[PDB]
Write a protein that holds these residues in place. Sequence first.
Motif, PDB file in Angstrom:
ATOM      1  N   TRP A 164      60.481  24.711  26.604  1.00 59.22           N
ATOM      2  CA  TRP A 164      61.600  24.941  25.737  1.00 59.22           C
ATOM      3  C   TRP A 164      61.318  24.867  24.248  1.00 59.22           C
ATOM      4  O   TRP A 164      61.633  25.865  23.572  1.00 59.22           O
ATOM      5  CB  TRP A 164      62.730  23.957  26.159  1.00 59.22           C
ATOM      6  N   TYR A 165      60.871  23.765  23.649  1.00 58.01           N
ATOM      7  CA  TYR A 165      60.683  23.641  22.220  1.00 58.01           C
ATOM      8  C   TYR A 165      59.863  24.758  21.599  1.00 58.01           C
ATOM      9  O   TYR A 165      60.130  25.251  20.492  1.00 58.01           O
ATOM     10  CB  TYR A 165      60.286  22.267  21.808  1.00 58.01           C
ATOM     11  N   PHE A 166      58.863  25.288  22.294  1.00 60.50           N
ATOM     12  CA  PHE A 166      58.084  26.404  21.822  1.00 60.50           C
ATOM     13  C   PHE A 166      58.498  27.791  22.280  1.00 60.50           C
ATOM     14  O   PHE A 166      57.794  28.773  21.957  1.00 60.50           O
ATOM     15  CB  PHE A 166      56.704  26.180  22.450  1.00 60.50           C
ATOM     16  N   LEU A 167      59.473  27.931  23.186  1.00 63.36           N
ATOM     17  CA  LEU A 167      59.804  29.299  23.572  1.00 63.36           C
ATOM     18  C   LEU A 167      60.105  30.149  22.362  1.00 63.36           C
ATOM     19  O   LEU A 167      59.352  31.113  22.189  1.00 63.36           O
ATOM     20  CB  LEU A 167      60.727  29.417  24.740  1.00 63.36           C
ATOM     21  N   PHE A 168      61.025  29.861  21.428  1.00 63.50           N
ATOM     22  CA  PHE A 168      61.208  30.764  20.285  1.00 63.50           C
ATOM     23  C   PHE A 168      59.872  31.379  19.904  1.00 63.50           C
ATOM     24  O   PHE A 168      59.625  32.562  20.113  1.00 63.50           O
ATOM     25  CB  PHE A 168      61.953  30.240  19.063  1.00 63.50           C
ATOM     26  N   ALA A 169      58.962  30.556  19.399  1.00 64.59           N
ATOM     27  CA  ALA A 169      57.701  31.124  18.943  1.00 64.59           C
ATOM     28  C   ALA A 169      57.166  32.078  20.000  1.00 64.59           C
ATOM     29  O   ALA A 169      56.943  33.234  19.645  1.00 64.59           O
ATOM     30  CB  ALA A 169      56.713  30.039  18.580  1.00 64.59           C
ATOM     31  N   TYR A 170      56.985  31.643  21.237  1.00 57.54           N
ATOM     32  CA  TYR A 170      56.477  32.519  22.295  1.00 57.54           C
ATOM     33  C   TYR A 170      57.141  33.881  22.283  1.00 57.54           C
ATOM     34  O   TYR A 170      56.698  34.832  21.625  1.00 57.54           O
ATOM     35  CB  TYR A 170      56.622  31.818  23.638  1.00 57.54           C
ATOM     36  N   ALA A 171      58.364  34.031  22.790  1.00 56.12           N
ATOM     37  CA  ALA A 171      59.129  35.231  22.498  1.00 56.12           C
ATOM     38  C   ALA A 171      58.606  35.905  21.240  1.00 56.12           C
ATOM     39  O   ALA A 171      58.055  37.007  21.274  1.00 56.12           O
ATOM     40  CB  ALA A 171      60.628  34.988  22.431  1.00 56.12           C
ATOM     41  N   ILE A 172      58.798  35.312  20.066  1.00 54.78           N
ATOM     42  CA  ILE A 172      58.398  35.968  18.859  1.00 54.78           C
ATOM     43  C   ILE A 172      57.074  36.716  18.945  1.00 54.78           C
ATOM     44  O   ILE A 172      56.949  37.896  18.583  1.00 54.78           O
ATOM     45  CB  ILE A 172      58.488  35.194  17.658  1.00 54.78           C
ATOM     46  N   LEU A 173      56.106  36.043  19.514  1.00 51.65           N
ATOM     47  CA  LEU A 173      54.749  36.423  19.787  1.00 51.65           C
ATOM     48  C   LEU A 173      54.577  37.632  20.700  1.00 51.65           C
ATOM     49  O   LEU A 173      53.693  38.471  20.545  1.00 51.65           O
ATOM     50  CB  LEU A 173      54.024  35.282  20.544  1.00 51.65           C
ATOM     51  N   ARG A 174      55.281  37.609  21.831  1.00 52.59           N
ATOM     52  CA  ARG A 174      55.164  38.739  22.736  1.00 52.59           C
ATOM     53  C   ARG A 174      55.639  40.019  22.078  1.00 52.59           C
ATOM     54  O   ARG A 174      54.992  41.062  22.173  1.00 52.59           O
ATOM     55  CB  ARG A 174      55.979  38.535  23.986  1.00 52.59           C
ATOM     56  N   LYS A 231      47.537  41.620  19.220  1.00 54.14           N
ATOM     57  CA  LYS A 231      47.487  40.169  19.383  1.00 54.14           C
ATOM     58  C   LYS A 231      47.358  39.432  18.062  1.00 54.14           C
ATOM     59  O   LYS A 231      47.897  38.336  17.905  1.00 54.14           O
ATOM     60  CB  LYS A 231      46.396  39.770  20.364  1.00 54.14           C
ATOM     61  N   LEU A 232      46.716  40.047  17.073  1.00 55.32           N
ATOM     62  CA  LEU A 232      46.627  39.414  15.757  1.00 55.32           C
ATOM     63  C   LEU A 232      47.968  39.497  15.043  1.00 55.32           C
ATOM     64  O   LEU A 232      48.429  38.568  14.386  1.00 55.32           O
ATOM     65  CB  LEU A 232      45.531  40.051  14.913  1.00 55.32           C
ATOM     66  N   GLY A 233      48.657  40.625  15.224  1.00 55.93           N
ATOM     67  CA  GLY A 233      49.965  40.762  14.589  1.00 55.93           C
ATOM     68  C   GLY A 233      50.940  39.750  15.176  1.00 55.93           C
ATOM     69  O   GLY A 233      51.889  39.404  14.483  1.00 55.93           O
ATOM     70  N   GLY A 234      50.744  39.344  16.417  1.00 53.42           N
ATOM     71  CA  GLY A 234      51.572  38.392  17.122  1.00 53.42           C
ATOM     72  C   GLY A 234      51.357  36.963  16.608  1.00 53.42           C
ATOM     73  O   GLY A 234      52.293  36.162  16.712  1.00 53.42           O
ATOM     74  N   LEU A 279      50.005  36.066  13.593  1.00 54.71           N
ATOM     75  CA  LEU A 279      50.566  35.962  12.245  1.00 54.71           C
ATOM     76  C   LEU A 279      52.078  35.809  12.340  1.00 54.71           C
ATOM     77  O   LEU A 279      52.681  34.802  11.932  1.00 54.71           O
ATOM     78  CB  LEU A 279      50.132  37.169  11.411  1.00 54.71           C
ATOM     79  N   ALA A 280      52.734  36.677  13.111  1.00 55.39           N
ATOM     80  CA  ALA A 280      54.174  36.554  13.218  1.00 55.39           C
ATOM     81  C   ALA A 280      54.614  35.409  14.107  1.00 55.39           C
ATOM     82  O   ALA A 280      55.807  35.227  14.380  1.00 55.39           O
ATOM     83  CB  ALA A 280      54.761  37.884  13.654  1.00 55.39           C
ATOM     84  N   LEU A 281      53.684  34.616  14.604  1.00 58.19           N
ATOM     85  CA  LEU A 281      53.944  33.399  15.362  1.00 58.19           C
ATOM     86  C   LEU A 281      53.968  32.231  14.355  1.00 58.19           C
ATOM     87  O   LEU A 281      54.796  31.362  14.457  1.00 58.19           O
ATOM     88  CB  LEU A 281      52.764  33.113  16.393  1.00 58.19           C
ATOM     89  N   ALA A 282      52.989  32.292  13.477  1.00 62.41           N
ATOM     90  CA  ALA A 282      52.812  31.421  12.342  1.00 62.41           C
ATOM     91  C   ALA A 282      53.983  31.555  11.368  1.00 62.41           C
ATOM     92  O   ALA A 282      54.514  30.551  10.893  1.00 62.41           O
ATOM     93  CB  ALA A 282      51.509  31.786  11.622  1.00 62.41           C
ATOM     94  N   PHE A 283      54.398  32.788  11.094  1.00 64.62           N
ATOM     95  CA  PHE A 283      55.482  33.021  10.148  1.00 64.62           C
ATOM     96  C   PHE A 283      56.838  32.596  10.663  1.00 64.62           C
ATOM     97  O   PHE A 283      57.745  32.246   9.901  1.00 64.62           O
ATOM     98  CB  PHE A 283      55.449  34.475   9.715  1.00 64.62           C
ATOM     99  N   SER A 284      57.022  32.562  11.976  1.00 60.70           N
ATOM    100  CA  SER A 284      58.317  32.142  12.496  1.00 60.70           C
ATOM    101  C   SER A 284      58.696  30.762  11.938  1.00 60.70           C
ATOM    102  O   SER A 284      59.802  30.540  11.489  1.00 60.70           O
ATOM    103  CB  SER A 284      58.187  31.936  14.033  1.00 60.70           C
ATOM    104  N   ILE A 285      57.710  29.891  12.091  1.00 60.07           N
ATOM    105  CA  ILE A 285      57.701  28.492  11.757  1.00 60.07           C
ATOM    106  C   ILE A 285      57.468  28.231  10.276  1.00 60.07           C
ATOM    107  O   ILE A 285      58.151  27.457   9.600  1.00 60.07           O
ATOM    108  CB  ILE A 285      56.621  27.741  12.565  1.00 60.07           C
TER     109      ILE A 285
END
Lengths: 241, 379, 64, 22, 62, 81, 147
Positions: free
Chosen positions: B272-282, B287-290, B292-298
Motif C-alpha cells: 500500500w504505502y508505495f503503490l502510488f509510486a508503482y502505478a506512476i512507474l508502470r 524504464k528510465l522514464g519510469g 525518473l517519473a518515480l523519483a519525481f512523484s515523491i
Amino acid sequence: SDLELHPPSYPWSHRGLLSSLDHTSIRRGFQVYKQVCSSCHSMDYVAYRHLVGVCYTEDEAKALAEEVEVQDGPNEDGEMFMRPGKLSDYFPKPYPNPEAARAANNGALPPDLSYIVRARHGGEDYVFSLLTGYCEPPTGVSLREGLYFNPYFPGQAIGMAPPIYNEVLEFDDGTPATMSQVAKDVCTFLRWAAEPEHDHRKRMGLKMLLMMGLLLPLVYAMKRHKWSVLKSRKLAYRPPK
Amino acid sequence: MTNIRKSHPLMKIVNNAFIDLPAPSNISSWWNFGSLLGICLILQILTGLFLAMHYTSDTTTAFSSVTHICRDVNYGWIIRYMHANGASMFFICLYMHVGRGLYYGSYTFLETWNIGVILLLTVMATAFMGYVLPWGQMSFWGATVITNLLSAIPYIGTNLVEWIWGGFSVDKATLTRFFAFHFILPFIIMAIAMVHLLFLHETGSNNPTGISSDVDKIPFHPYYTIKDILGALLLILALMLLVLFAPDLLGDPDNYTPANPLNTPPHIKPEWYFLFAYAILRSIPNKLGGVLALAFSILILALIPLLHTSKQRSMMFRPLSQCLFWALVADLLTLTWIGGQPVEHPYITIGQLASVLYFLLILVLMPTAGTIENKLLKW
Amino acid sequence: DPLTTVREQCEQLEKCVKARERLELCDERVSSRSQTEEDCTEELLDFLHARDHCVAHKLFNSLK
Amino acid sequence: RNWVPTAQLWGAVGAVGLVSAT
Amino acid sequence: VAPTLTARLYSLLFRRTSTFALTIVVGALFFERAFDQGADAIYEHINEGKLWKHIKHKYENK
Amino acid sequence: GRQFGHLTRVRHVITYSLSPFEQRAFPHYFSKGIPNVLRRTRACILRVAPPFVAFYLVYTWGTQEFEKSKRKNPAAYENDR
Amino acid sequence: AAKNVVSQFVSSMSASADVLAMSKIEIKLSDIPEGKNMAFKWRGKPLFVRHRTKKEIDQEAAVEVSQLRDPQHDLERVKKPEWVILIGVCTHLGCVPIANAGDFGGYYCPCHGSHYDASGRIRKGPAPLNLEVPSYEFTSDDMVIVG
Ligand code: HEC
Ligand code: HEM
Ligand code: HEM
Ligand code: FES
C-alpha cells in the motif's frame, strides 16, 4: 489468464471477532493430516506441541509423538540411534529433501502445510474449496493424468490425488467421516498450524476493547475538563475610540 | 531565578518546548499526526529492537527466525505483528501529516518542510528494507525488481545495482546489509526528526484560518498534552484493532512462503504505502522514464513552495483549491488501486490518465486555480 | 454423505435452474472442428459459483 | 514536618507498587 | 446532610496526592483482577466447550 | 526571543473565562453537535464528496470491463465463424 | 494496560518455548544394572548415570576429605547413595572420561592420564576440579529428572 473461482467465503466457527477455535475440530483435523497427509506434505514449524493447543495430554502426545519417532524417527533426521521418547522433534519430513519429494510426485513439490492457510491467497476457504472441489473436466478439454482438473486452481489444474474421500480414516469418538466433514476438520487444524496465536489474540482483543471503551470516554472527559476554560470563554472589545 | 526547576538545569529548559511553548488555539485534529508520527517512530524502534533481539539475518534462517519469533518466543507474536502493523500506521499518519502541509500551506515554513521531505524519504528507505528482512517470496522479488529498476541509469546503473546487492543476485550479502541499514536508519531518523522540531520551534504552527495566531496563543501543557494523549489512545486503538483482530488484513501480501529464487509473483507489488509510486512507474513504456517519473512523484514535494500562487496561505478560504486538492487525494486513491491491478489494458489506460492527472493537479491545475481565486477576490 | 445432498438442493433454486442452461448448451453445442478455445470452463464456473454460495450456508449446519 | 507523613505515604506507594506491579 | 459519594471519596483520598497515588496503586491491583476474572469469563462463555479448558475431560486420568 | 511576552501587541480587549470545576465538559453533547456537525458537513460535502464519488464510478466501471474483456474470452472476436 | 504491555515485552527475554523444552528435558529408566555407567546426551554434553554397588558406596564414602585435589565428601554429591549422576566432560582439556576405567574404579581420561574415582573426584593427572554435578530430582522410584 484464466478466471479463478477464488471467491469462497466459507461459513466458520471462528469467523467472528470473538469466535474461537474448536479444538475437537483441531483434534480431528490433526489425525486427518497425520494419516491422509503426512505422506507427502510436511509441517516443519510444527512440533508435537498439541498438548494444550489440541487437548492432547502431555502423556497423550508424548505417546503419539513417540511412535512417530519410532517409525519415521530421527533416522530420517540423522540421529542414527534414535527411537521413541522425545518431544522437541518436529513433524517428520515425508522425504529426505525436496528434490526427492518432487520425484515421488513427478516434478511437483508438495507444499509445507504449516502456513498454507496463511500463505496462499484466500485462507482456509480456498483450502476447503479445493479439497472439496473436484468436478468434471469441461467439454472439449484435455488432461494429462497427473493434471487432474480442479475448479479452484489458478492455472485450472493441479497434480492432486484424491485429497480426501469418504471413509478415508476413522476418529476416536466416531465423528462421521464425510469427505467434507473431514475437510472441515482438516482445514481447522490447518488454521491453527498457520496461526497458533489465534485464540490468545482474540481473547486479548476482548480485553483491549473493553479497556478502550473505558479510557476513550474517560480521557475525552479529561480533555473537556481542561479545554472547558477556553470553549466556555467569552470576549469583549472596548476601544477608547 | 532560583529553584525554577525548568530553567535551573539548562537541559531541562530545552524540554519546556513541550510545556510553555505558545500553541495556536484554533487547530484542527489534523495536528496530532506530528505527535503520533513520533510515537510511531518510538513504537517501531522499541518493538524492532525486541524483534532484532531474536531474529537472524541469513538466507537459511531468516524466515525460520521470523517464524520462531511468532511461535516459541513469549509474546513474540504480538510484538512482531505490532511491528508489522506499526509500519502501516506510521505511513497512514505520514500521509495525514503531509496532506495538511499541502492544504493549510504549512510548507510556507520552507526550511521545516524541506526536512519533512527528507524525513519522508528516510522512512520509505527503512520500510523498504525491513519488509525484506523476513525473506518471504514477496519481499525477495520486490527487492530485486526495485533495485534493478535503478539499473536504468545508462552509464553507471548496472555497476551500481551490483554494489548495492553486494553480488549478482540478492543472496546473503544483500540480506545482511538491509538488516544493518534498517537498524541504524531510524536512529539517524530521530536526529532528523529533532532537527525538524528545532526549525519549527522558531515560527510556531499554522492554523485552519491561515492567519497569525500570536494574538491568540495557548500554553502547550494544559491543553495539547491532553489532546496528544487522547490522540495516542485513538492511534493505539487503530493499531491494536488491526493487530489483534485483523492481523494481516492490511498486510496485503499473503506470501508467507520462503523465497524460491525462480518463481512467479503473479502480481508483485510494494505494500500500500508505495503503490502510488508503482502505478506512476508502470505508466511509462521506457524504464528510465519510469524511474525518473518515480523519483519525481515523491520529490515533486520539494517544489510545492515554489508553486504557491495565492495570497492566502490557507486553502480553507479558497474553494477551487479545495476541490482540486481533494481530487488529487482521490486521484492518489485511484493510483493505489492500480497498484494491486494486473498489468493489463483496463488498468494501464486508467493508470496512465491518473498519472497525468496527478502531475497536472500539482504542476498546473492548482497554480492556475490559485491566480483565479486571487483575481476573483480582486487581490 | 452430508456434502453430496446439499449440493443438489442448491442447484434446485430458480437461479441455479436458470443459469444451468448456459452449461447445458455449451456441453453439447460444440461443433465438429472442436475449437479447443471452445473450452466449456467459463460457463461451468458460473454454475459452480452459485451452487457453492448456497452450499456453504446450509452445508455448515449439517456437520460436526 | 509534613514530610514524614508524606514520605510515609510515598514509601507506602512505592512498596505496594513493587509488590503488585512486580 | 452528608457529602455526596464523590465528596466523601474526595476528602478521604484525593486531597493529598500521596493518598491519591496510594489509592491508584491499590485500585490498579483490585481492578486488574476483577477485569480479568470478568472479562475472561465473558470470553470463555462465548466459546463454550470450544477451548481445551472445557475439553480436558476426554483424555484425563482414564 | 522569549515567546510569551514578545509575540504581538494587543490593546483594548477584554476576555472572560470560568473554571473547569464550576463548568460542565459536555453542555449540549448532541443538540449542539448534530446541527453543527450537520451544518459543516453540508458545507463540506459539495467540496469534498465529488472526486471520491467519481473514483467509485471509475472503480466500478473499471473492474467491470476487466472481468468482461477477460471473462468474455470470446469478447474480442466471436466463436461461430 | 502498561502492566501487561511491559510484562509481555519483558517475558520475551526470559526463556523460549523452544529453549525451554529441551533444557530440563531428561528422564531415566531403572535398567542401569549396578555396575554399568550409562550415558545420555543432555544439553549438548555427556550425561553419565551410574547405578552403584554397596562396595562402591562403601569405598567412596571412605575417601579422606582432607587430601582430595578438589575436596568434596562423596556423600554431598549424590542425592541417593545408590545413584551417581555426572557431566561426562573432562575438567582438564575437555575429552570424555572412560566409564569404569583408569586406576580408580571410576572413569578414565585417555588424553593426558586423568584418573577419576567413582564419585567424580580427581585422583590423578592435571585435571583440576572434579567432574561436575547436574541438578536433578528423583521422581517416583523409576523416574529420574535431570535439570
Ligand atoms: C500426496 C499425494 C498429497 C497429499 C496426501 C496431499 N497433497 Fe496437497 N498437493 C500435492 C501435490 C503434488 C501438489 C502440487 C500441485 C501443483 O503444483 O499443481 C499439491 C498441492 C496442494 C495445494 C494447492 C495450493 C497451490 O499450489 O495453489 C493445497 C492447498 C494442498 N496441496 C493442500 C493439501 C491438504 C490440505 C492435504 C490433506 C488433506 C493435501 N494437500 C494432501 C500432493 C498431495
Ligand atoms: C523506524 C522505522 C521503521 C520502519 C518503517 C519499520 C518497518 C518494518 C517493516 C515494514 C518490517 C517487516 C516485517 C514484516 O512485515 O514481516 C520490519 C521488520 C523488522 N524491523 Fe523494522 N521498522 C522500523 C524501525 C526498526 C528499528 C528501529 C529496528 C531495530 C532497531 C527494526 C528492526 C526490525 C527487524 C529486526 C525486523 C525483522 C523481523 C520482522 O519481520 O518483524 N525496525 N520493520
Ligand atoms: C519522521 C517523520 C516526522 C515526524 C517525527 C514529524 C514530527 C512533527 C511534529 C511533532 C510536528 C509538530 C506538530 C504538528 O505540526 O503536527 C510537525 C510539524 C510539521 N511537519 Fe513534521 N513530522 C514528520 C514528517 C514530516 C513530513 C514528511 C513533512 C513534510 C514532508 C513534515 C512537515 C511538517 C510541517 C510543515 C510541519 C508544521 C506545520 C505547522 O504546524 O504549521 N513532517 N512534524
Ligand atoms: S582431556 Fe582429560 S587429562 Fe586431558
